[PDB]
Symmetry: D3
Subunit: 233 residues, 6 copies
């Protein structure tokens, strides 16, 4: 496809979608066997391998609705991908959401215009695939993680001049901010395929708490395991 140099058949039907291509590399090297790298266009690494005997892929998406939309469109339309699980990070809005919690997004709010252009006059609420959601929830519960299922904000702007509206969204139960889920869920629904976002809380937006990858590595690894485990079902 335009942004992926893989041949037909090189990408598995189940795929994990980290934002960071170097996390795709980490995931492939850490969890998968019989790995190949099928893409390096724009440095946006993608790999296919095997996990507990089942083929699965992992593809960086970049940051933001427009970037992930490019990759998700191509994966679905050109490579026949059927199950897409974003595995990423997010920033907690609410005090009761803690760093290292795992959030499974039921739906996402957004300040993107992408859906207003498609459905003029409507608020489109992008929805996770429930069967994937339940599988991931059950796996995370069994794994011993703190798992929160709820609403997130998909933001276009990481650096917002005022966080007043983000605070207000927190007062309406929104758990955390990230930059991709609306697009993944909307496009998966458009094409009749299955999507989910499983997120590690890496920072808290108002307290200023932050982590390095190493400082959340054990939680992150466990989260990747549940995302894979849902995928292989």
């Amino acid at each position: 496809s335009v942004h992926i140099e893989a041949k037909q058949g090189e990408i598995a039907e189940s795929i994990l979608l980290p934002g960071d291509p170097l996390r795709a590399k980490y995931i492939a090297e850490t969890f998968l066997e019989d790995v190949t790298c099928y893409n390096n266009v724009r440095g946006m690494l993608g790999f296919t391998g095997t996990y507990k005997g089942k083929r699965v892929s992992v593809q960086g998406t970049g940051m933001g609705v427009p970037s992930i939309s490019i990759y998700v469109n191509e994966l679905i339309q050109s490579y026949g991908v059927k199950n897409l699980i974003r595995v990423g990070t997010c920033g907690a809005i609410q005090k009761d959401v803690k760093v290292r919690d795992v959030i499974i997004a039921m739906t996402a709010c957004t300040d993107s215009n992408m859906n207003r252009l498609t459905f003029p006059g409507f608020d489109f609420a992008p929805a996770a695939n429930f069967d994937l959601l339940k599988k991931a929830y059950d796996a995370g519960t069994e794994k011993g993680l703190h798992v929160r299922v709820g609403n997130v904000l998909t933001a276009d702007v990481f650096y917002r001049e005022s966080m007043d509206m983000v605070k207000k969204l927190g007062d309406y139960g929104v758990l955390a901010v990230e930059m991709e889920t609306t697009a993944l869920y909307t496009l998966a629904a458009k094409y009749g395929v299955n999507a989910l976002s499983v997120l590690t809380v890496s920072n808290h937006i108002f307290t200023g708490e932050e982590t390095t990858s190493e400082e959340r590595q054990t939680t992150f690894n466990e989260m990747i395991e549940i995302a894979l485990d849902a995928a292989i079902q």
Copy 2:
């Protein structure tokens, strides 16, 4: 409160919210014991009784976002209600959704302006309480119903001049149309309480299939049972 004549303490902390006040009466008479009627203002019947030994209420909401918003605000703010389950009907958009299916709304799309006014420039995605959702899903699965968990449209207009956008929403996975869920979910989130909508598909919007209450009574009764059963947990 302005629209409910009940005394403090007369309304239980768990409440079912049919749109039709005569369905509130049917639910109270059919399922509850030790019933009183606490409201007849505007004919919008409300009752409190006991189900399997646990106090529970049932309150008509009327049709549309503005009507249900009035009742939900008053129930939460004046009567201390904590768990609110809308029990209603909806019209299927998709061919694969069948009359007599039970839909549990994860989230809702809308053509209402209510949330655009609150969050200018954002799409707010109203979310069910996951713990109530899971309880209802598990109960419905055990009860032997066809249960679908997904997205609905909360419409302001029942009689729409063109159904083009409703069809398009169906192509993006939206299951059915109804007229209340966005408001219930948004206000419950605002006030930190728990909400869910459990819906019976009573009509199919493009095929023209329709039912009378009697023609869906067994399914409807089973749906009320799961809504109660979730409530009493």
Copy 3:
């Protein structure tokens, strides 16, 4: 029709539209002769009788744009209704508007999205039928009421978190808040029929003054008389 169980011909061509179905009952019992009740679906009472020898009906609408839109569509399209007069209550915004004043709405502002969806990019100003307006104005003037003709707000939200915008509308001459007129006027114009809203001020939104039905009964009765009197012309 879907929400009205009347046979063809049972509803008169002129109809009064209170929001409260119990007010429809009061109006029929108090003013009309040879009364029948043609609807009890959803408790939304409707009656037909005679006033000064002329057939006229009265139909509850419920609260909010979506509810009244359902009933008005059905009355016009399925029952051939030609003259529709909402008779309701409203909350004064301005200090110079007093409780027990009668407001005849020339037009209505709104926070509903209903007309933005129909006329994207435009502000649609819904207009009363002038000939009905003049008849009601002349009748109210003769009856000795305080009658104000002007602008109202049709609100989707009764419980608004901030009343700043309602205050601002008052500073631009808007007289009072209610929850139905935009829909009635827009749909009547769509179908080429005649509509008017005649409202009793029952509360003042910033002073906190409020009334019971009994406390405004004489004014309300006189208002119903002028609404009927316009109708029978």
Copy 4:
């Protein structure tokens, strides 16, 4: 003021507002006595004189919401004007509205953003002063004119690429198109003063019928007479 060179007191409290400054000149020369010209800034002629013994003024506004807004703000805020009657032309949308009809605008629709900026999320419906409206209606009825009271469109664009939305507005009862009324009515309401628009239909937008000033001069003169006659009351 910035756009009017008159001294304080030179402009009367009642004023007619044609769009064309040369029509202001025609009105002053044809109907008024003891006339002075108080403004020629930008060629936007303004005059004060006497009609049936009462002082009255006439001020060109130019075309469009932004132009009339400048003049109306200055007249109200700097010159203390209290009664403002636009006297202009319009293009009929509906077949049943005829060239040479006089339309008295109750309210106006618009494609301008002026009120959306002031009342974000709301449709503001600008309203005529009813007492001026009634006076003009009664005077026009007595004068023997065809007078229509209703809704108009205040357009920003005279040359619209598609007239689809204008046709649709006609199907919702909107009588004619012009380019000033929303602004006049909104600003008069803002400042607590009295406004009305009295319009001659000079063209029909879909049939292509058009007139010269001479071809509508008798109707136009009679319309000016009723506008003055209302003003002097």
Copy 5:
């Protein structure tokens, strides 16, 4: 055309567009030879003459997007005009922009709805013709003027209740406020012809500095010279 009484061929292919028709007269009398006046409809003076031997015209536009849009549509579509240079005034927002500076607008921001109606969901950025822009810039630089090339605001409202957003636009580099450029640039682009706006700063919006025409006459004359000089190339 509807608003211009000129015969075909009486208007030159290059035209200057002051907002004030009396400035059109001043420009024609001061700079042009062999002058005729081709329009006095609505007092909106237009002239054709010769400058350094080349035919050129000058046409008042009035104030605001809707007024200039009328004239620009007619000039382009009915009179075959190819090069259109607005020559006007503006109000500085930024402290670093000085009265008597000449601003050449690269593009324009707006609070008009004109382009949102044409391109729903998009921000359209109207662009100057670069070749005209460069010619005017080079001529102004040679003439010894202070020339600033940048962004302006095309406002619908001269009298804005709050200038907060205008200040904010200044903080994002917007140089000055005026009331026509968006329309000129958008329509010229639509029809494939060449437009530019060359503006004299006549007032500073926050400091209150203001000028009479006489107080900026030398700068204004030099600006007209560069606008002509670009035109005749």
Copy 6:
């Protein structure tokens, strides 16, 4: 900063901003001397070196408004960058724009919501720094390139379901589509620094013409040279 691991002082005040980090590497290796790599976070390569003796940097941005906004905010606010030139590719809309043309964006249209959120009710037109624009234009003209200066579309969606609006923008003179310029120009203006986008046309959106990097390498190299050459001035 959060997404760049460079120490203070490691990034030069002038920077080129390709979307593709592998193009940043190509630019550094091909044109610069004394090169270091200061960032590999998320694979988003950044380098500093010397060109004709002057320090300059090159930093990948990723694709889309949200991605470039992250990097531009950090470069300006944390690293003190003053001159930012995006060097990228774009897709021609118009037939008269050819593959291998170089487009210098004066301004950009967008379907992003980023500026509507910042300036509610306004269309913000993001503007290039004119002095950088002129330098690049003069350098490209001297270099013998086909250089077009004009308007572009900054799109959020690469894969748009209908290209109707993109075609319409082409009919209003918009030259090409890309995915970053609105953000770069808006943020540079916000912070008072200098930005420009210099683009190679790599594909034609309606004809289907496309190129590989090798197939446009000579043009691309010349474009990089002019971007550098402007930068070092």
